[PDB]
A = this chain, B = another copy of it.
Amino acid sequence: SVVTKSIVNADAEARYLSPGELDRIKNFVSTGERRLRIAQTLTENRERIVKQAGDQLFQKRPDVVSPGGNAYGEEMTATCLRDLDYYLRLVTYGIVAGDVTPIEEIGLVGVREMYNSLGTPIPAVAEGIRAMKNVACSLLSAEDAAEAGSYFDFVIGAMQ
């Protein structure tokens, strides 16, 4: 969260929070209701976001669903859709927190290594999350879509 990041930096430099950091958390506090509303609509539409974004991802990357691909067969495809659902959940967490700290702490620290042990391609995971971003942005209002899409953008950038 923004509050914990400000406290962490202040603790590292052994000084009380500067008025700039205090103003930063104050403005974040003010926009908290909008953040919660964005997370609420995302979780309300979580099922269709995952479903149709996954279909777009398969079209974008046919090799994934081709024989020999990581998500070959209905069982493997089901688990990949589960991963997409997990990342949507992390994105809602991050929007509520106001920082990418929860997303990083839960599903971006060692993401490369976990996927290489699994055998799964990280860039293809990024493409799937891009599809989720498109669906979520369509569901959201223009102002709301900019914020939530930015969180999706961080996730895909880390995947790359």
Assembly stoichiometry (copies): 2
A34 CB, nearest partner CB in chain B, Å:
37
A68 to B65, CA, bound (A): 10
Interface residues on A, range: 10 to 19
Q: Does A150 contact B (CB under 8 A)?
A: no
Q: Which residues of B contact A110 (CB under 8 A)?
A: none
Candidates B61, B68, B121; contact of A62 at CB < 8 Å: B68
Q: Does A67 contact B (CB under 8 A)?
A: yes
Beta-carbon nearest neighbor of A66 in chain B: B66
A66 to B68, CA, bound (A): 10
Contact flags A59-81 to B (C-beta < 8 A → 1, else 0): 01111101111101000000000
Chain A residues near B (Cβ < 8 Å): 60-64, 66-70, 72, 116, 119, 121-123
